[PDB]
Design a binder for this molecule. Structure first.
Ligand SMILES: Cn1nccc1-c1cnn([C@H](CC2CC2)c2ccc(-c3c(-n4cnnn4)ccc(Cl)c3F)c[n+]2[O-])c1
Length: 236
């Protein structure tokens, strides 16, 4: 996260850190708890992942340094990538992780609701991007989970900033005109979380952008509301 600030414990309890363990253990991507056995993340995260065997899902984590050899984690039973996914910039950047067991929800590990049926025309004005990613394009995975408040941009404006790409209704963009706050390397797969009527909804999945926090180059997110039917079909 560029231009963000440190979170505190329990602040974003649906945020998980997905680790790979091949050839070494490291944070790979963010993700969001959406059910007791289900993480929603980005399909692009699994480029070069040979199988679910090497993945570990950690929940209730504030600092990456909390993770040691005896830290509990969830195994991944299945990676479900959208059947139309080819590359992040062309959309369908969405994946479900089915965990090997059920999360028991606690103050530190909580689900986030999907965008609600009937809220199709809600204007979200309180949206936050979170993660352990870089604070600038040439950096390092951060220890403490970072947060940044970022305004949604219309798809029309977003297309004007990305005239080499097809910005579709299945994407949502977010960013300041002058830049300064954005996701960056290591944040993808995590949530764009928006609060409406004091309830958090998973509005976006952090996906891609041209650089990090550049002026007139918003971050691009998978528009979760357009995949609710797909999510429900897979989780049922
Ligand atoms: C894990 N790891 N450890 C070390 C390095 C990394 C690493 C490297 N790239 N990535 C991912 C993709 C990769 C996981 C398949 C990635 C790709 C793009 C973005 C991104 C950007 N950026 C544009 N230029 N940089 N960022 C801007 C906006 C928005 Cl909205 C974004 F999503 C974020 N991430 O995370 C993780």
């Amino acid at each position: 996260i560029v231009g963000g600030t440190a979170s505190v414990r329990g602040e974003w309890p649906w945020q998980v850190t997905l680790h790979t363990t091949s050839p070494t253990q490291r944070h790979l991507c963010g993700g969001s708890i959406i059910g007791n056995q289900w993480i929603l993340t980005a399909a692009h995260c699994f480029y070069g992942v040979e199988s679910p065997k090497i993945l570990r899902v950690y929940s209730g984590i504030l600092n990456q340094s909390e993770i040691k050899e005896d830290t509990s984690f969830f195994g991944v039973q299945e990676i479900i990538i959208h059947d139309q996914y080819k590359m992040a910039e062309s959309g369908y950047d969405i994946a479900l992780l089915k965990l090997e067991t059920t999360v028991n929800y606690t103050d530190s590990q909580r689900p986030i609701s999907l965008p609600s049926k009937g809220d199709r025309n809600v204007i979200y004005t309180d949206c936050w991007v979170t993660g352990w990613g870089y604070r600038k394009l040439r950096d390092k995975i951060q220890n403490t989970l970072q947060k940044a408040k970022i305004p949604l941009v219309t798809n029309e404006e977003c297309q004007k900033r990305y005239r080499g790409h097809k910005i579709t209704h299945k994407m949502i963009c977010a960013g300041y005109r002058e830049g300064g706050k954005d996701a960056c390397k290591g944040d993808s797969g995590g949530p764009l979380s928006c609060k409406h009527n004091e309830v958090w909804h998973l509005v976006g999945i952090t996906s891609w952008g041209e650089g990090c926090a550049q002026r007139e180059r918003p971050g691009v997110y998978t528009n979760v509301v357009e995949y609710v039917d797909w999510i429900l079909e897979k989780t049922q």
